Every structure is written in structure tokens, then in C-alpha cells.
RNA sequence: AUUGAAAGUUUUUUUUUUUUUUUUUUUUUUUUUUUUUUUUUUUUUUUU
């Protein structure tokens, strides 16, 4: 399912999204385009929306970069064997040889691969 | 029917924070509301 939105905002007074602002300090220059004039970059929109969503959710897990607890490898294996898309993501990232169809291949695993898998689990959750 | 092929240069990151166009600056200094004009003229304290 795809949800499409066309949001409009009745901002009080004005806004300003600068960039570069040349050198020599003095005035503050809002970012230009050259042809279209001025715009708000999509990255700024995404950052503002992420901030608002983080405020809304108020998740303690998200506050500490999802690095506050140790995730058991058994749980990781259970999710991997239970979620096909998660398994596909893990295989596409850490490598097909490292992660087989069924199992984690602990012998080939090392510190950084394990950390990557734990971070992927935390962020996917 | 190319020696021969099939892969998105992709994900991810808010150009943001610090700063009161502020202090000082009395719409006042001068100019007599005076100036020419008689409250005046007419009338018997009185008759059969």
C-alpha cells in the first residue's frame, strides 16, 4: 500500500533555510537556486519530519541509538528463520557466504559482523 | 544473435546555535487685544 500526501502549511511570518552564505560573514544569505530562485531542500524536510516523529513516538530505545541492551543470537536466528524479508536484508548486507539459508555460521562470524547484525536487528525493530 | 551476460553509485545525516537597531535630542525664541465716540436733545410743578 502506498499513501500519497500533499501537505500545506500556513506558517506564521516567514522562514529561512540558509546555505553556504558566501564568506566575509556580514549578512546571512538564504540558499538560492540560480533559476528556480529559492527552495527548501528535501533533506531539511526529512530531518524535521524525523524530529517530529521521534517526539511523537517517545521511544527510549530510539533515544540511545538502539544500543542499550544485548540481543541474544538465538533471537536473531529465530527472527532470521521467521522473517523472509529480514533474512534477505541481512544476506544482501553481510554477504550470502556469511549467512546461509538456515543458520548463522558462527565460525565465519567475527566481531564487526556480529555488531552489524545486532544493529540491523535493533533498527529493524 | 558483439568473446558476453546481469547488476540503480545506492543507501543514511534538518545549514543549526549564540545577538532587543540600541543610547543620547523639552517644537521653543520674540509680539500689551488697542484706537478714535460727552448717555446727548425735546418738556414752565402745574387750573374751575
UniProtKB/TrEMBL annotation:
It comes from the Archaea. Coiled coil: none annotated. This is CRISPR-associated Cas7 paralog (Type III-D).
